[PDB]
UniProtKB/Swiss-Prot annotation, chain B:
Function noted in UniProt: Catalyzes the transfer of a phosphate group to glutamate to form L-glutamate 5-phosphate.
pH dependence of function: Optimum pH is 6.5-7.0.
PROSITE patterns per record: GLUTAMATE_5_KINASE, PUA
Domain commentary: Contains an N-terminal amino acid kinase (AAK) domain and a C-terminal PUA domain. The AAK domain is responsible for catalyzing the reaction and for proline and ADP inhibition. The PUA domain modulates the catalytic and regulatory functions of the AAK domain.
Entry protein name: Glutamate 5-kinase
Binding site for ATP: K8, T167, D168
EC number: 2.7.2.11
CDD domains linked to this entry: AAK_G5K_ProB (cd04242), PUA_G5K (cd21157)
InterPro entries, sorted: AceGlu_kinase-like_sf, Asp/Glu/Uridylate_kinase, G5K_ProB, Glu/AcGlu_kinase, Glu_5kinase, Glu_5kinase/COase_Synthase, Glutamate_5-kinase_CS, PUA
Activity regulation note: Interaction with gamma-glutamyl phosphate reductase (proA) seems necessary for kinase activity. Requires free Mg(2+). Inhibited by proline and ADP.
Length: 325, 323
């Protein structure tokens, strides 16, 4: 009976479409979560609003149009944001815990497992995790970049049964991607209006509300779900045949099919695979250092030993360490 | 004339040696900072106490002695902690900004500079950065591992003139003073319970122990290397150890004896002597497999061995910090 639900609240949900966090709207969504919590369910919050909270608290100041500006606002806003969640949940006797992360914290199976553990330890002790991107401390390069996608990753981390993406009803687009990442990991996804009375309870019960996305009948293997989180450390461009081999046959990537290789990356790191078109067709763990791949690109499997002076098997990226599409 | 001070407050300072954060002791220290802030000075806080705040807030629950327990405590505790710093600084009309980080945020020049700019943007706008390790989201492998060392890095990031390590009155404190002192930052170790200690340190009044900034500091372009977590290691000749330590020379592949791990060109690595001691960290010019392949060989052979070449040196003196 007990279930794990991730609720994602983006900025216009939190502000009610104004330039200020709306505590009336938020406390009403907290009340709904509390009700499910009191009933034995596990609740995870993914929250936006750090920058809006900061802008408000500093009195809307003139700032250089720079990333430093946004990060300074998030440093201030995130302080205020977590307070707001803490105070509001405390009305209902519920404790919260702050987690701030980026793709960097999922560049490994190990760092992914670490984040998973923290989050499950929170839920196991009846604390609600309040998750957001670590905006104050991050380069654009390591960020998830939108909270829709982040909440899917959080759903995976939490071993969630459902993901609820609240809307204030491009914005639709990240939501569809999130629904896709989540469903493939075996998690039901619902897009629904934050302003709909009893929305969160309805979703939890199974009452048709918002837009339903069924979890994949047979989900992507648990052991490789962490690859969804990793930021690709470089990109590999690949054959017409290799492309087909990966998308149709679900096969591994042979260096025979590699056309080019961009970036510096090591064996063990996750990289992006592109077709000649330029489209991202897969992410997967590299078996070879990047200087070694440029070297064995185009050559058959039996040749690797002799080109490099060593081998780490015949495959550039193994299907078991790969996520297509 | 206006200055930049980093104040580090560990757990026993914030609790006054009990298991609860002491709001009385803390507001007094905040008052001292605020007085310096109002006079034009730039104040940065490096705070411990997330775990202690967490246990108290949860009512001292019985938790498994695991790292996930510590991480849950930090997740709850950091939240309480940032709230306490904000509430108290606001007494004085001062805003705070939360920054949580690990060595990962300093594994790179770019990520290092990104944090630098954020911390300095906070200060230019009179906001006090409240800095801590990201204990809720981090593996052991990527943490600084102690807030003494963390504050030395924070001082570097901030372009601090002084670092003040507050005590409940040691080795991690001496380590942090070394890092700061080398980066040209005066480090003071002194008792947090000393009346006017923060204000006194700013005025240069003798309180506790002062460690002087290095007469000629480590070059600024390479200070970020104190921050990085080594991505792998190299073990090195008796000859190469001596060239590095005694004559500050670059590292040539000839003296490389072994290579540990998987890493790329551009990543910081650790250099070990044969006895196993850490003697320098420096940016690798070659990937780890390439290094295994050219270890013990002359620079002339690199191109012929690898099929390419990035200069005669495995780790340049310019991208290296010894010790
Ligand atoms: N951290 C994100 C913003 C958060 C976010 O995207 O929230 P949403 O777009 O789901 O309202 C960024 O890249 O600035
Ligand atoms: N929070 C950090 C460091 C805390 C710390 O050691 O500071 P201390 O209380 O020793 O001055 C951690 O990773 O344990
Ligand atoms: O749109 C926004 C407001 C705050 C920031 C965040 O991710 O918290 N993004
Ligand atoms: O000793 C402690 C208290 C909490 C944690 C921290 O430094 O935040 N370490
Ligand atoms: Mg201390």
């Amino acid at each position: 009976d007990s279930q794990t639900l991730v609720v994602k609240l983006g900025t216009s949900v939190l502000t009610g479409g104004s330039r200020r966090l709306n505590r009336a709207h938020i406390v009403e969504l907290v009340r709904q979560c509390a009700q499910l919590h009191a009933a034995g369910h596990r609740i995870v919050i993914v929250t936006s609003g750090a920058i809006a909270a900061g802008r408000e608290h500093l009195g809307y100041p003139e700032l250089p149009a720079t990333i430093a500006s946004k990060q300074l606002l998030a440093a201030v806003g995130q302080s205020r944001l977590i307070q707001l969640w803490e105070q509001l949940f405390s009305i209902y006797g519920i404790h919260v815990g702050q987690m701030l992360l980026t793709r960097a914290d999922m560049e490994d199976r190990e760092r992914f497992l670490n984040a998973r553990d923290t989050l499950r330890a929170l839920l196991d002790n009846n604390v609600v995790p309040v998750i957001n991107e670590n905006d104050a401390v991050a380069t654009a390069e390591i960020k998830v970049g939108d909270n829709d996608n982040l909440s899917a990753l959080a759903a995976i981390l939490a071993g969630a049964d459902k993901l609820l993406l609240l809307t204030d009803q491009g914005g639709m687009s990240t939501k569809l991607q999130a629904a896709d990442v989540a469903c493939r990991a075996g998690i039901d996804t619902i897009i629904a209006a934050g302003s709909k009375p009893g929305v969160i309870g309805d979703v939890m019960e199974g009452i048709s509300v918002g837009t339903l996305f069924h979890a994949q009948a047979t989900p992507l293997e648990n052991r490789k779900r962490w690859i969804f989180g990793a930021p690709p450390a470089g990109e590999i461009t690949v054959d017409e045949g290799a492309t087909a081999a990966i998308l149709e046959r679900g096969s591994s990537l042979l260096p025979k099919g590699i056309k080019s290789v961009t970036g510096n990356f090591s064996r063990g790191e996750v990289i992006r695979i592109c077709n000649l078109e330029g489209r991202d067709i897969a992410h997967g763990v590299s078996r070879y250092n990047s200087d070694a791949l440029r070297r064995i690109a185009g050559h058959h499997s039996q040749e690797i030993d002799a080109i490099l002076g060593y081998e780490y098997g015949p495959v550039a990226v193994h299907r078991d360490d790969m996520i297509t599409r």
